[PDB]
């Protein structure tokens with residue numbers, strides 16, 4: 001199960017039922033859980049923390065030092081949870097002193113060439129398309145869908161259930177449940193396909209849609225819009241999430 | 256010729272005069288033809304079918320399972336023909352039950368980082384630029400030129416002799432002989448440079464140009480335009496290909 | 511320091527205090543200087559020339575033959591200087607007969623997936639973001655900052671101290687000290703953040719800003735603008751560099 005043509009530092013901690021292919025390189029100060037599959041020519045570097053049930057494809061590089069020139073050799077980690085699919089040549093750099101941990105959650109698919117920068121946070125259940133670049137200290141909430149070649153600026157946040165269209169770029173927050181597309185990026189309606197696939201009721205979908213008609217299409221500033229959403233849209237956890245996300249948005253939200 | 260520092264599963268079928276570098280990983284259920292060169296740290300995975308006379312550069316990954324979450328472990332292949340240049344970190348995933356075979360033809364150049372998704376079809380004589388992403392079940396006809404960082408949506412088709420400009424994205428079909436550029440993508444004239452390089456007559460080039468003036472610049476709907484092309488442009492296989500491609504376009508064509 | 515699980519051709523010239531990880535592949539006709547660190551699964555190919563004090567991350571490929579189909583097997587090199595950071599899956603192809611040497615200078619950071627084409631020239635002190643593609647025979651002057659997913663057309667030149675925003679593409683020259691952004695790309699003001707960080711005086715910054723107000727915002731053609739800059743902006747090496755760069759621009763400059 002562990003190929004003798006892998007390089008595995010004696011100090012690496014490796015769980016049970018782990019398959020390691022030839023030409024895998026595993027450093028010291030590495031923790032790997034159970035039921036992982038690490039394919040040929042992958043690199044698991046100093047500071048990596050891997051959970052259970054993941055598949056790491058050829059050429060993936062987990063734990064390299066930050067690309068941030070402010071890095072000065074401080075201790076940090078690069079972490080993934082359980083049941084993720086980490087495709088070919090995906091890079092997940094370890095953290096900087098700004099946070100100290102780059103973290104990916106559970107049940108994500110990071111397609112080939114995806115980059116996860118120092119101190120980034122990915123939740124659970126996300127799909128991130130080919131060669132998308134997530135810059136320093138970003139946050140992706142659960143259940144987001146990001147297409148290929150997306151550029152997410154540092155410090156931004158993406159809400160749950162969004163679909164970001166391929167090739168888009170953005171340097172503001174993207175609030176939950178929306179489609180973000182075009183150049184420059186813009187609110188492009190609700191992710192109705194995603195929400196219907198996930199079994200959201202037509203009524204909840206319509207409420208979400210009405211909240212965003214208020215936010216984006218009623219000529220109201222952000223405070224007034226959120227007031228009106230709170231007054232006029234039948235309340236539910238989904239509507240509270242919209243409101244809370246926007247009200248506390250660190251960057252502001254996209255147009 | 257075959258490095259002893261390569262890993263080659265005993266069941267892999269390997270032809271004559273094949274050069275395999277150190278740290279190449281070749282799985283079972285692999286067929287490789289004659290006169291291939293496979294460079295260091297390349298991966299040829301379960302289900303790969305490789306023809307003759309190819310060069311596979313370092314870090315290329317052929318045959319990994321689809322990125323489609325609908326994949327359920329069905330048998331499939333990833334295939335390349337003869338005389339291709341498969342550059343660094345090119346990914347060619349094997350197929351899904353939707354078709355079952357990802358196929359690249361002969362005499363293509365897939366530049367570094369190019370992704371070929373499950374069930375895609377590439378013809379012959381194509382050039383595909385750095386990190387271009389071809390999504391599921393796409394079709395590329397012979398002799399196309401696609402620049403770098405292009406995003407081709409699933410189920411789309413690209414006709415012969417096109418030039419798609421760098422960074423463009425599209426989710427409709429691109430008809431033969433044209434330049435497609437800008438954002439949003441658009442018909443940008445004829446690929447006269449390509450056609451002149453390939454020895455097309457000035458007369459045939461002018462006919463093609465006239466067909467597309469009718470299609471794109473005469474205010475006609477698609478049916479009327481194609482009627483008029485068939486009536487007024489001197490007929491040739493090139494003009495029939497334009498007409499047939501557009502008339503049977505599954506997605507519609509770009510604007 | 512040199513792993514016995516690396517492949518190193520006996521003819522490769524390797525300097526002192528060089529750390530080489532497992533699964534590194536080093537060819538013949540390679541020169542590597544002192545104090546280098548070459549990480550696992552990197553490839554240093556025929557014709558590579560590496561200076562001192564560099565770090566080459568996993569999956570980087572230095573020296574592969576040009577992607578230019580005009581290449582006919584001529585001798586050429588791929589070269590990097592001193593103190594560079596060459597990140598994961600960076601590709602630096604060797605040259606063609608058009609020049610014969612692909613050259614990267616000193617103290618650069620080439621982030622993951624960056625491509626450096628045949629015969630390209632990179633200076634010193636540059637930062638080039640994730641997966642940026644530099645096409646054939648380009649030139650990057652010292653101290654440039656290029657963000658991620660940038661496409662630089664062949665034969666173009668980028669001046670010092672620019673910031674090119676993420677996802678931009680361009681096929682004209684970019685003159686020194688500016689921000690280039692948007693689609694289509696455009697002059698977007700001065701790189702004041704960069705210049706202030708590097709300790710430029712507020713007075714020199716204001717002069718630069720005034721030169722570009724003349725060039726871009728005064729309705730003057732290029733000759734008249736440069737005449738007026740030479741007459742009205744207090745002279746300094748920075749202003750002479752602006753003027754000289756534009757006056758001798760091979761492609762013309764961006765709008």
Ligand SMILES: CC(=O)N[C@H]1[C@@H](OP(=O)(O)OP(=O)(O)OC[C@H]2O[C@@H](n3ccc(=O)[nH]c3=O)[C@H](O)[C@@H]2O)O[C@H](CO)[C@@H](O)[C@@H]1O
Nearest residue numbers: 109127145163191193194195322323324325390391392409
């Ligand atoms: C991660 C995954 O499994 N992706 C697969 C999935 O893509 P995906 O489900 O995106 O593709 P489909 O072609 O099924 O989707 C139809 C349309 O719905 C859109 N859409 C989809 C989901 C969503 O939450 N919001 C939304 O707006 C898509 O962008 C597309 O325009 O099916 C494709 C077609 O079989 C496959 O090639 C992809 O590999």
Ligand SMILES: CC(=O)N[C@H]1[C@@H](OP(=O)(O)OP(=O)(O)OC[C@H]2O[C@@H](n3ccc(=O)[nH]c3=O)[C@H](O)[C@@H]2O)O[C@H](CO)[C@@H](O)[C@@H]1O
Nearest residue numbers: 364382400418446448449450577578579580645646647664
């Ligand atoms: C695959 C290949 O060999 N590419 C090489 C080729 O590019 P390519 O032939 O594209 O480059 P050139 O600079 O020769 O082309 C001149 C112009 O014609 C355009 N054009 C080209 C072909 C076409 O079918 N349609 C069209 O519109 C190009 O985009 C460019 O704007 O020459 C460049 C300059 O030596 C090299 O760096 C590239 O590596």
Ligand SMILES: CC(=O)N[C@H]1[C@@H](OP(=O)(O)OP(=O)(O)OC[C@H]2O[C@@H](n3ccc(=O)[nH]c3=O)[C@H](O)[C@@H]2O)O[C@H](CO)[C@@H](O)[C@@H]1O
Nearest residue numbers: 067068069070135136137154619637655673701703704705
């Ligand atoms: C190579 C490097 O060390 N990059 C790091 C640096 O990026 P960088 O310095 O680019 O990031 P900052 O967030 O510090 O910059 C603030 C703003 O200034 C802009 N700007 C920056 C420099 C410049 O010359 N011109 C200019 O216009 C940036 O694009 C940004 O919009 O700090 C980020 C935030 O800690 C880190 O995640 C990056 O890894």
Ligand SMILES: [Ca+2]
Nearest residue numbers: 247248249250
């Ligand atoms: Ca606040």
Ligand SMILES: [Ca+2]
Nearest residue numbers: 059314344569
């Ligand atoms: Ca790689």
Ligand SMILES: [Ca+2]
Nearest residue numbers: 502503504505
């Ligand atoms: Ca039909």
Ligand SMILES: [Ca+2]
Nearest residue numbers: 757758759760
């Ligand atoms: Ca001249």
